[PDB]
Amino acid sequence: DQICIGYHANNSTEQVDTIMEKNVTVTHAQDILEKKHNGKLCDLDGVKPLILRDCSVAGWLLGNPMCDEFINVPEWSYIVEKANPVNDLCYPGDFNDYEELKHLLSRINHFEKIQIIPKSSWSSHEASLGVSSVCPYQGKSSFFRNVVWLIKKNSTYPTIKRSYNNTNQEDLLVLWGIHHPNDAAEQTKLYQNPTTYISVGTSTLNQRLVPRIATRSKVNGQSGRMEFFWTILKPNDAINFESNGNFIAPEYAYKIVKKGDSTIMKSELEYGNCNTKCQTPMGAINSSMPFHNIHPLTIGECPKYVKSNRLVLATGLRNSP
Amino acid sequence: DQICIGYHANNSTEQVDTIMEKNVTVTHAQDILEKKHNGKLCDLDGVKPLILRDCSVAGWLLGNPMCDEFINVPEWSYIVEKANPVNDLCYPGDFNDYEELKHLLSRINHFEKIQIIPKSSWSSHEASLGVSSVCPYQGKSSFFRNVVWLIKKNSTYPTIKRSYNNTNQEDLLVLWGIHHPNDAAEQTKLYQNPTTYISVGTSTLNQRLVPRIATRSKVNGQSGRMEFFWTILKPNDAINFESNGNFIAPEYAYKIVKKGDSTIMKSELEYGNCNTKCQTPMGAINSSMPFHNIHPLTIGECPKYVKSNRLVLATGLRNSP
Amino acid sequence: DQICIGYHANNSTEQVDTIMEKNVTVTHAQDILEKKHNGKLCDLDGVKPLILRDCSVAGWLLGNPMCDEFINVPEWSYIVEKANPVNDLCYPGDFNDYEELKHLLSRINHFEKIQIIPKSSWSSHEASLGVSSVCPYQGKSSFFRNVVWLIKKNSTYPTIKRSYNNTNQEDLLVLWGIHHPNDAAEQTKLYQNPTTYISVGTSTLNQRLVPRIATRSKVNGQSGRMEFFWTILKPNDAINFESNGNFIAPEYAYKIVKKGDSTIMKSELEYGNCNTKCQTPMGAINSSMPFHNIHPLTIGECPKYVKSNRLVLATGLRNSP
Amino acid sequence: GLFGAIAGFIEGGWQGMVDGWYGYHHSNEQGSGYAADKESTQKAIDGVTNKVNSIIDKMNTQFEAVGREFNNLERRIENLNKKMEDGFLDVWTYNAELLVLMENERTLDFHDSNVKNLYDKVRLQLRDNAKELGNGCFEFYHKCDNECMESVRNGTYD
Amino acid sequence: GLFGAIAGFIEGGWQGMVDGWYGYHHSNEQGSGYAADKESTQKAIDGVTNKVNSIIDKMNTQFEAVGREFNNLERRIENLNKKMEDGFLDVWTYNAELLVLMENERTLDFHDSNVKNLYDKVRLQLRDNAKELGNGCFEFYHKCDNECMESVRNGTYD
Amino acid sequence: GLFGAIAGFIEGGWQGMVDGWYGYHHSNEQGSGYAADKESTQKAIDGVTNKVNSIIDKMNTQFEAVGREFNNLERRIENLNKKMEDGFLDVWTYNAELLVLMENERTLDFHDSNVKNLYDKVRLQLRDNAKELGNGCFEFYHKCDNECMESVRNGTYD
Ligand SMILES: *[C@@H]1O[C@H](CO)[C@@H](O)[C@H](O)[C@H]1NC(C)=O
Ligand SMILES: *[C@@H]1O[C@H](CO)[C@@H](O)[C@H](O)[C@H]1NC(C)=O
Ligand SMILES: *[C@@H]1O[C@H](CO)[C@@H](O)[C@H](O)[C@H]1NC(C)=O
Ligand SMILES: *[C@@H]1O[C@H](CO)[C@@H](O)[C@H](O)[C@H]1NC(C)=O
Ligand SMILES: *[C@@H]1O[C@H](CO)[C@@H](O)[C@H](O)[C@H]1NC(C)=O
Ligand SMILES: *[C@@H]1O[C@H](CO)[C@@H](O)[C@H](O)[C@H]1NC(C)=O
């Protein structure tokens, strides 16, 4: 008669690593790294992202006519933009402090576009003629829908003194621009005056723009340049515009509704018609694991990102052969 | 007859955590996290901080008349500034490269203010008239005590060509400014000339300022703007001033005495009449623990900051019930 | 008769540390920290560094006449520059966005200098007279060899309209400059015209420079200033130059050949006539250890840098006395 | 492993003990079979469960990368940003992999220790009236019958 | 715990042993009482003291936050600065908490091991001439008197 | 150390055992000498070798400092850069030193454990027919001759 002490074995094939020994076969293990995703861009908690498609954040906000799909956008959970969007800045130029605007945008879930200066105003200056073939719409020469390229009337460009008060509760994103023609003759033709300026003022802003004339490479057949500026107009503040030419003027501005949690994610994917609690630029995650190795940049209730290919904890004991 | 092996128990109630087990009661333990402070701002090793009270670093240095308490300040250990100081920049504007100056200041323990250009000079221009109601002192219209707002004399503003040599051993912080009036008429009234400039030069600096005229919101009833600049004038170098209007001119500058270890800490607290070897924005620490969890930003001989609520090491053994 | 169990001892004197015990003598140990270097600057994998000696990256690229040694440099593995090179910017001034250029350079192994605008051109303006005594060569007044200081011809400075096309495959680093004279009289003397500009344009660049006149300290006996700018001209793009004075003009530009792995290391050492697979600013490393404590900044197949003075692993057991 | 029982003096585990991590195999005139030791198995379950929860919790405050953009002449700061984000991810990857490696070893050893302590508990009870075979088993001097076997398992023997 | 003595085969500690961490309880015709084993207690004190000092020292080169300010149009760098400072603090918080957790376990186990080794030392001396009870105690075959007891404690018995 | 054999109940090591980490010393009428136990020595070599390779590998993804330059009015970012690079180096220095400290302790203990398990293996074989001296040695009741000694070493005794 005999009694023995012993321990469990099973048919487990699960393996774990230790400092002194790799691939130890154990009776039980818990994998803690999520390695799978669904390859789609999804709603986050019921809330659809803003998918820019072929538009840039600049093209969207300025109202590139190629970006009509985004004329009026509902609340988003996050924004998706391609690495190299074709529809950006149809008329060549720069967008001043663009990255600081992108950054500001990553902490915004809703815009509400309101008109601040009507096109059917500017009795002194021509508003319907500021159009280029580089910004086409339906085969016709058009232009950024949210700003008005003002041209002389009857060969006159009288000094402009216009202003807008922010009656709204909400902070207002306001965009304007300046045109840099490429020679002395273009200046007179667009604007009678030879030496011009645009001055912009609020309580914090003390701006004076001056067009920089020079010959430059044709970009999409154009030698002129646009340069766009923006400010955040605090509620109850007023913006003062003064110019005698080259003024690309606000028609519409954006009310900042939401101030939600957000990011601009870079992805080539399109909408996937799904819902998730955790989104990556490569696909969504549905997991209760504490780690994942999909992509560093996520949004939602997400596991922690590591670069491992494998994270498996022993729970059971060394399985005997 | 019988002999036994055993181990100590006691009435200890001290508890420690392990990976596999929380709240193990042990016979002895050493707590290593300082959790207490005294809630006061104190001298560091005998050396009183500079407590700005309601003044900003800008208000203090420019000499806002509301900041007379800081006309002449002794060596400090560190500087304390509120989150939103009311007495900053009494006449609206900006302070150029302010944060890079704040940064420079965090490595300075002593200033010594010397006069570099006397008010009782400027025979050509009016010095006693550059005063505003937005910068009051004793019910009267006054202005930043360290700079002189120069105005025309007998409707004349002759070109200024003034310079100062740094005879001192010590680096010199020099501050000047430019006034941005809000229309053509203010320009002539303050300064006869229509188109003006301020040019500043040292061995490294090649500056030319030009006033930006424009209409802007009334801030504290004012539409003008001041914009202040600074430089660090090396010893034996000279600064060259040239202007025909809008020049806000140096009267006093700061000798950089000490170059001590320091910080600008943000705190709403006032002086506590105490001494310490370790100061936080929330209170001082007196501890021999290696860690604390009070605030990340400290000065002095301090424990290391962690975010834990509890750090207790076992020294003794598992206390039996 | 007797059998015993036991373990090895030896004459080892090797010591390791543990949490509970310092300097335990062990029978065997493996040291894992490389503590030695050779004190020399060496070729990396057969490829000689560019050792600037007494020249700065600016002096080299602009072609300071004191930097002739670097007229034509072969492929380098890395670049070495002293902390404070004497031969930088012989005529006083600034180099605009210098650090962003240095950064760009750290990802470049080979330049190939080509002529883009010939000196024996500029029929309208004098090219052979733009020379200073602050930039001497062989006892004579000279100037940066890669740019041409253009002066008036017969008291005439006609507007310049010059351009260059990048026919090459390779990106082209192009450098130009502007001269800031120190008074009205110097302007006329060098250039007839009183109010001048330099305008530069490519597909991305929209520049207009204007000379800032002012009195400033004599630096190496000079009150004028040079300010140098650069751009990276994409292949098939063109750069447009327009100026009526103060133009310091491109003669030579750099073809970007290699786009190799690199750094600018700061070292006072000179070439050591050796080869290595791992270089530090203080000397080269030849080791199979995984760690070293020489210097943080290395290039090549290097061990990992730690701040330890000692890293020794036990392999054997506690050696008995 | 460290404690010498698992795949040491006890050569391998039991496919036939299905209801626990550690237990007993008995063999006598009436028959033979396996019985899990419920108390030590349960102690082990708690320890291992707590460990997994401790590991997860300590790692729920890792670094979260944030999208951040820069222009053509902000290369230095872009690179700074990149090396910072990657720096943290490398630290946390290392932290996670190492904790798993080290704790995996502690778990294997803990099991080994639980088995050795269970073995010693029985050796201390049995004392003289059984022969210690050297392989995990004790061979009784006296006949041992199911209720005798039960008293060894329940700790109330002799 | 791992070594099976503390709250294992020795069921609980001694309120009455006041002068040391580990020791002996004797009981014979002349009386009964406790004696700390000074050598193992002192070894344990050194180990634990060194450990605390090692832990403090390794952690005296943690990251120190520095005040740093930014304007309205330097948001990206401000945020970078914030996530960097918090990143380090999270790493060091984790490092500190984990080291404490792991070393707390090593300390409990070390005590357990010290007790087991002291027990084995006496078992190895006593050998045959005492009955190993299974609870930390040995019951002598021969009468054992204070000086006999002393020789067990001082390691010079038989 | 934790397992009580090395510099515990076995007082010191053997200068004369040259061919292994653990082994046997025999002494009988025909003579005396040392024999390394090849199996446990080899197990120890693998473990220690793997450990060193694991340690090196986990540390081959440390932070690499990169040269980065700034002008006179970019002080804040320069300082940010400096505190970031130093921050990482401090983290990795700590990681390296701690891993070495902790694993050095695990290695010493592992050796101690290998010695104890080898000792128990022989004790379990010898059983009754030898006297356990308390110092690592067993003194035979019967005469033991080289081939007898061999059977203890090879695990096939009695
Ligand atoms: C461990 O097993 C895996 C199988 O998934 C194999 O790829 C790997 O090479 C093995 N590692 C070692 C060192 O045995
Ligand atoms: C530069 O020269 C090439 C070669 O003819 C030409 O194709 C290219 O268009 C030129 N650049 C511009 C802006 O035209
Ligand atoms: C441990 O004890 C503390 C009492 O301070 C209690 O708050 C905590 O919930 C306990 N934790 C667990 C898991 O028992
Ligand atoms: C903007 O309009 C509101 C509404 O009347 C007014 O109270 C506010 O003062 C205006 N802003 C300024 C700068 O006056
Ligand atoms: C350990 O030994 C070294 C000799 O290299 C000595 O400098 C050090 O002070 C010793 N440390 C301790 C605490 O014994
Ligand atoms: C400043 O004054 C000192 C004292 O004479 C003089 O030596 C120095 O050269 C002056 N600075 C300049 C730029 O001349």
Author numbering:
A (entry chain E), B (entry chain E), C (entry chain E): 5 to 325
D (entry chain F), E (entry chain F), F (entry chain F): 1 to 158
Task: Quote the passages of the study that discuss this structure, keeping the authors' original sentences.
However, a prerequisite for efficient transmission of avian viruses between humans is a change from preferential recognition by the virus hemagglutinin (HA) of α2-3-sialyl-galactose-terminating host cell receptors, predominant in avian respiratory and gastrointestinal epithelia, to those terminating in α2-6-sialyl-galactose, which predominate in the human upper respiratory tract. Thus to better understand the nature and significance of such adaptive changes, it is essential to monitor HA changes that may affect receptor specificity of avian influenza viruses, particularly during human infection. A single amino acid difference was observed in the HA of each egg-grown virus: Asp186Glu in A/Vietnam/CL1/2004, Val134Ala in A/Vietnam/CL105/2005, and Phe151Leu in A/Vietnam/CL2009C/2005 (H5 numbering). The effects of the single amino acid substitutions in the HA on receptor binding were also studied by X-ray crystallography of HAs in complex with pentasaccharides possessing terminal sialic acid (Sia) linked to galactose (Gal) by either α2-3 (LSTa) or α2-6 (LSTc) linkage.
Introduction of a more bulky Val134 side-chain in the mutant, in place of the highly conserved Ala134 in wild type HA, increases the width of the hydrophobic channel between the 130- and 220-loops that form the front and left edges of the receptor-binding site. As a consequence, the H-bond between Gln222 and Ser132 is not formed in the mutant. The distances between Gln222 and the glycosidic-linkage O and between Gln222 and the 4-OH of Gal-2 are also slightly increased; as a consequence, the H-bonds formed between Gln222 and LSTa are weaker and Gal-2 was not readily discernible. The crystallographic structure of the HA–receptor complexes provided an explanation for the poor receptor binding by the Ala134Val mutant HA, namely that distortion of the binding site by the bulkier valine residue would potentially cause a reduction in the strength of H-bonds between receptor and binding site. The consequent increased width of the site is more akin to that of human H3 (and H9) viruses with their preference for α2-6-sialyl receptors. In the Ala134Val mutant–LSTc complex, only Sia-1 was detected, suggesting slightly weaker binding of the human receptor analog (LSTc), than to the wild type HA. These observations are consistent with the comparative binding data obtained with the wild type H5 and the Glu186Asp and Ala134Val mutant recombinant viruses. Detailed analyses of the binding properties of the recombinant viruses containing the Ala134Val substitution, observed in virus isolated from a fatal case of H5N1 infection after 4 days of illness, showed consistently that binding to α2-3-sialyl sequences was reduced, but with no detectable increase in binding to the repertoire of α2-6-sialyl sequences examined.
